[PDB]
């Protein structure tokens, strides 16, 4: 048999599969999807363009440890993602910065001046709890309306006041002129795509890969010691406490007969269209092609779980599940879905590494 | 008694495995298809390289068949790009057509024979053979010693490490000799490449919920604890029976892939080198895939003794060794052998598919 049965071949499951196997363990990693990599899986479309079938996946981290780790399995294309937001018929920097405010209102404030201007408009909040509070308390009611309110309502189906502060706190507000989506120390894409990096990661002879397979389809007749489950929690426990909310997305992919379609990798639509944004994969990968491929993101209530929904009622409901999980003797939970945390890739990696260390000492 | 488990454990994700998996699953059987490699499709696997060029890591794979049955079957899993492969052979510093034909003869010897003449020409140089048995017989008896030496003897010696006389007639008889001006490598009814590659086609083929795909796994690593009713084996026969009769010869290959900053390196899909270099041939994938790209990627093939089994070696000595293993296989109760490696048959893609499909109809009987 195996020492470990890992459910989910994304970062959480693949990072652990790699570490355990590098330390002698015999690992069987399985996934219900026909491919590995989970959400970060990438492949070439019919036109021969490299794309992310599950939406834009830009790698960024502040962890020297995380970056040096991945570096063992892939070279890097230096890349700092940038996003424009379609507001009032323009394409403006988001996160909001000096340039956003100046171009929108036709002002000419310096950075020093825009700090006072924000001050003069930000609503005061006794205690910031909601996604509305974080933004409104920093940059006033108007900017909140034009950049965050609409987008949030469309993405989650919930007003920012029905969401925890951490959600819209992901996008910081700047008084400077930095226009990168991330100020992280390390920002780079795997030179030949995520999938390629996962294959290196899972190359050990100590790793058996099983695809197109629900773990429940084999758990009964396959000898294993410990289980590492990276799927959704509520599903692991047959939805015993009811359905734990997970927001989902639909992706409509297109290929155009032109080299470039967008000014940058991603354009957000806070106040227009059904989709939240369009992305162009050549901006992100650096691939050269006579054509180009893009993807439109439509928020959905039903579908494969991609987003936990951070808010009081869901935090509580998860705690019920967390209780069962912590009780689950021979099963360790890790990942964005398994532990219900709005995590980026690097964060999942860290959580995985840390989980590996405990399982080791 | 223990678990019932999978109805079928299938070893190999090549055409032999995949076709039986799809057929079995579609019929309602639970299948676990396993392969020691980290990908499906066996030799026919294809992928994009670092440059973004669709290539065949295991050498050039051109699909051709005369079986309508087979073509329509594979058509269920992929659209087609019509392609008719054309090889050139480097002889006397020239690039001449092979199969040998009217143009090959005329251009090589600077002749002006008509089709009707090249027939009399061949007749006049052919060596007679009481009974054709070797690869030397099939050729020499048709186009003569000189053409044989120039197009076959050197190539064959390099590919197999054996003189054509040390190989069965069936080996070189694969390449027809022509009196017409056909320069196609195949004259089959249906010649086309899978529009988006073989891998895409295989994914559709193993996509059923009834099929579980296991990669990076030698069946021996699991056949001890995973329950299964019947096994379909598609690897080398001798290895299945622990070489209890000794190593069955299989020829291997080393592939050297290159990418060049040009649009096109070769006049055709493949160029053969019967009398030059270590490698037997070079191939440019864009000719075969139809892909558009500012660069191009090619593969050189180097015949090898040691390595992964790619070719059975048809000759009396080996046919005699295989026959013993064949009896073992025929005795194997809950084991079905099918494919190029598992039945020791020099088969093309379309042939293996056909053999799998037949195997399936028998299983369903
Ligand atoms: C649209 C989108 C864009 C994103 N962009 C970025 C970005 O730009 N930068 C960034 O850092 N992060 C981004 N992320 C977040 C990033 O994708 C996650 O941090 C990371 O993918 C989480 O990895 P994971 O392994 O924990 O979960 P996953 O990657 O989802 O892997 C979990 C796997 O578990 C499998 N599974 C679940 N249940 C079962 C079961 N029952 N049986 C078998 N298999 C099962 C699933 O099929 C899935 O493949 C983005 C996420 C989304 C949705
Ligand atoms: C260089 C080259 C070029 C070719 N070109 C053409 C062509 O142009 N046109 C054409 O029609 N045909 C071509 N062929 C032939 C074609 O590849 C074969 O007909 C076809 O691939 C045979 O399929 P198969 O499934 O029977 O064997 P394979 O495709 O080899 O699949 C067998 C699989 O079994 C796996 N396996 C074996 N033992 C084990 C084990 N112990 N545990 C787990 N897995 C195991 C192997 O890893 C392998 O993937 C070519 C072959 C080669 C080598
Ligand atoms: O223009 C915006 C952007 C965000 N928000 C709000 O702030 C939240 C967080 O925004 P994220 O971009 O971080 O949310 P995503 O998961 O949808 O985006 C993913 O894709 C992006 C690519 O553009 C980034 O790389 C990001 O880190 C990555 O997790 C949103 O849910 C929303 O409530 C807006 O109101 N307006
Ligand atoms: O120029 C040649 C070609 C062949 N032979 C001899 O005849 C045999 C049969 O030749 P193949 O080309 O058929 O050998 P392969 O299996 O290596 O070829 C594979 O690669 C080819 C790519 O051009 C074709 O697609 C072919 O059908 C495919 O199975 C060779 O082994 C050799 O003995 C030659 O002497 N000279």
CATH number at residue A317: 3.40.50.720
Clarify whether residues B65 and B176 are in a common domain. Answer: no
Clarify whether residues A329 and A214 are in a common domain. Answer: yes
Which of A12, A13, A15, A40 best tests ligand 1's pocket when mutated (most atoms within 8 Å of CB)?
Answer: A40
Clarify whether residues B267 and B156 are in a common domain. Answer: yes
Clarify whether residues A284 and A357 are in a common domain. Answer: no
DSSP state of B168: B
Of B52, B206, B217, the CB nearest to A48: B52
Clarify whether residues B154 and B254 are in a common domain. Answer: yes
Task: Kindly determine whether residue B216 and residue A208, on different chains, have CB atoms separated by under 8 Å.
Answer: yes
Q: Which helix (H) or strand (E) holds A255?
A: strand A246-256
Clarify whether residues B208 and B126 are in a common domain. Answer: no
- Domain housing B340: 1-84+186-249+315-365
**DSSP structure string for A41-94:** --EE-TTS-EE-TTS----EES-HHHHHHHTTS--EEE----EEEEETTEEEES
Atom of ligand 3 nearest to the CA of A307: 16
Method used to solve the structure:
X-ray
Tokens standing for residue B194: 């899978």
Q: How far is A307 from chain B (nearest CA, A)?
A: 26
Residue A231 sits at φ, ψ, to 5 deg, of -80, -165
- Where are the strands (E) in chain B, listed by range? 6-11, 31-35, 47-48, 54-55, 64-65, 80-82, 87-91, 94-97, 190-194, 211-215, 228-233, 250-260, 270-272, 281-284, 296-304, 311-312, 335-337
Clarify whether residues A161 and A261 are in a common domain. Answer: yes
Query: Reduced to 3 DSSP states, what percent helix, strand and coil does chain B have, rounded to the nearest 5?
Result: 35, 20, 45
Q: Is the CB of B209 inside 8 Å of chain A's CB atoms? A: yes
Clarify whether residues A115 and A48 are in a common domain. Answer: no
Resolution in A: 2.4
**What are B232's strand-pairing partners?**
B10, B336
Within 10 A of B217 (CB to CB), how many other CB atoms are there?
A: 22
**B259 preceded by cis ω (within 30°)?**
no
**DSSP structure string for A299-329:** EESSSS--EE--SHHHHHHHHHHHHHHHH-T
d(CA A20, CA B83) in angstroms, rounded, equals 47
Clarify whether residues A30 and A129 are in a common domain. Answer: no
**Ligand 1, atom 14: closest residue by C-alpha:** A344
Clarify whether residues B216 and B346 are in a common domain. Answer: yes
d(CA A25, CA A342) in angstroms, rounded, equals 30
Which residues does chain B have within 8 Å of residue A210's beta carbon, measured at their own beta carbons? 212-215
Clarify whether residues A146 and A115 are in a common domain. Answer: yes
DSSP state of B34: E
Clarify whether residues B168 and B114 are in a common domain. Answer: yes
Which residues does chain B have within 8 Å of residue A220's beta carbon, measured at their own beta carbons? 3
d(CA B5, CA B122) in angstroms, rounded, equals 61
Tokens standing for residue B298: 């090619």
**DSSP structure string for B242-275:** TTTT-PPPEEEEEEEEEEESSS-S-SSSEEE-TT
Give the count of domains, chain B. 2
**B99 preceded by cis ω (within 30°)?**
yes
Distance B322 CA to ligand 4 centre (A): 23
Which residues does chain A have within 8 Å of residue B40's beta carbon, measured at their own beta carbons? none
Nearest residue to A2 via CA among B222, B38, B211, B2: B222
Of B54, B196, B217, the CB nearest to A208: B217
- CB of B134 shorter than 6 A to ligand 4: no
């Amino acid at each position: 048999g195996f020492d470990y049965l890992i459910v989910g071949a994304g970062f959480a499951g693949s990072v652990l599969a790699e570490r355990l196997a590098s330390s002698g363990q015999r690992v069987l990693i399985v996934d219900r999807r026909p491919h590995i990599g989970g959400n970060a899986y990438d492949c070439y479309d019919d036109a021969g363009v490299l794309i992310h079938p599950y939406g834009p996946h830009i790698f960024h981290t502040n962890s020297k440890d995380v970056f040096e780790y991945l570096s063992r399995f892939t070279e890097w294309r230096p890349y700092q993602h940038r996003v424009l937001a379609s507001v009032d018929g323009q394409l403006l920097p988001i996160p909001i910065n000096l340039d956003t405010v100046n171009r929108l209102y036709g002002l000419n404030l310096t950075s020093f001046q825009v700090e006072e201007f924000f001050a003069s408009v930000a609503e005061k909040v006794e205690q910031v709890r909601t996604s509305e509070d974080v933004v409104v308390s920093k940059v006033g009611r108007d900017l909140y309306n034009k950049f965050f309110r609409g987008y949030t309502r469309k993405q989650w189906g919930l007003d920012p006041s029905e969401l925890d502060a951490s959600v819209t706190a992901r996008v910081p507000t700047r008084t400077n002129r930095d226009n990168r989506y991330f100020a992280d120390t390390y920002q780079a894409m795997p030179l030949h795509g995520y999938t390629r990096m996962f294959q290196n990661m899972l190359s050990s002879p100590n790793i058996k890969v099983m695809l197109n397979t629900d773990y429940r389809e084999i758990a009964d007749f396959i000898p294993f010691q410990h289980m590492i489950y990276t799927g959704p929690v509520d599903a692991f426990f047959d939805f015993c406490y009811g359905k734990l909310p997970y927001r989902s997305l639909e992706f409509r992919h297109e290929t155009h007969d032109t080299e470039q379609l967008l000014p940058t990798g991603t354009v957000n639509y806070p106040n227009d269209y059904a989709y939240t944004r369009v992305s162009e994969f050549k901006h992100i990968t650096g691939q050269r092609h006579h054509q180009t491929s893009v993807v439109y993101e439509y928020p959905r209530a039903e579908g494969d779980p991609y987003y936990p929904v951070p808010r009081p009622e869901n935090a509580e409901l998860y705690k019920k599940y967390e209780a069962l999980a912590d009780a689950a003797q021979d099963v360790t939970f890790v990942g964005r879905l398994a532990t219900y945390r709005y995590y980026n890739m690097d964060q999942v990696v860290a959580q995985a590494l840390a989980t590996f260390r405990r399982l080791q000492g």
